[PDB]
Amino acid sequence: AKCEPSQFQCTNGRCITLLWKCDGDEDCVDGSDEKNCVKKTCAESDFVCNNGQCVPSRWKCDGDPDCEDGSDESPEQC
Amino acid sequence: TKMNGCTKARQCIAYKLDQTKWVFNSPDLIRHTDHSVQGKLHIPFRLTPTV
Ligand SMILES: [Ca+2]
Numbered sequence: 001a002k003c004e005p006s007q008f009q010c011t012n013g014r015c016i017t018l019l020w021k022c023d024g025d026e027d028c029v030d031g032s033d034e035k036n037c038v039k040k041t042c043a044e045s046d047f048v049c050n051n052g053q054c055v056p057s058r059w060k061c062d063g064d065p066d067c068e069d070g071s072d073e074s075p076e077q078c
Numbered sequence: 079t080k081m082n083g084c085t086k087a088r089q090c091i092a093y094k095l096d097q098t099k100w101v102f103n104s105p106d107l108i109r110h111t112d113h114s115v116q117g118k119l120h121i122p123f124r125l126t127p128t129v
Pocket residue numbers: 020021022023024025026027028032033034
């Protein structure tokens with residue numbers, strides 16, 4: 001379809017702006033707003049799990065593991 | 079809580095219960111299904127005649 005940004009048009013027909021591609025608000029049906037672009041994967045509210053994964057900081061040291069390397073809930077972190 | 083049949087985080091939604099003080103109807107706040115007026119607040123600073 002016709003769009004103004006003319007960037008990364010997903011299967012839903014919406015042109016994913018390069019910023020939108022890293023906006024963190026996944027918009028298209030495909031998780032295309034979080035792919036192949038530069039972004040601060042952790043904000044000031046977010047925790048860097050040891051392998052480079054990023055997740056809600058509240059998940060750190062909560063008694064219940066979350067990120068795929070377990071870094072949010074490894075006893076070494078708590 | 080593991081959610082059955084799910085594959086993407088956008089397929090589900092969850093929100094906390096809160097009512098500590100009611101919300102001013104505002105274009106930025108989605109209404110609850112029971113949008114009946116829960117209360118009324120007196121708008122301060124009445125305009126009054128003066129010299
Ligand atoms: Ca997006």
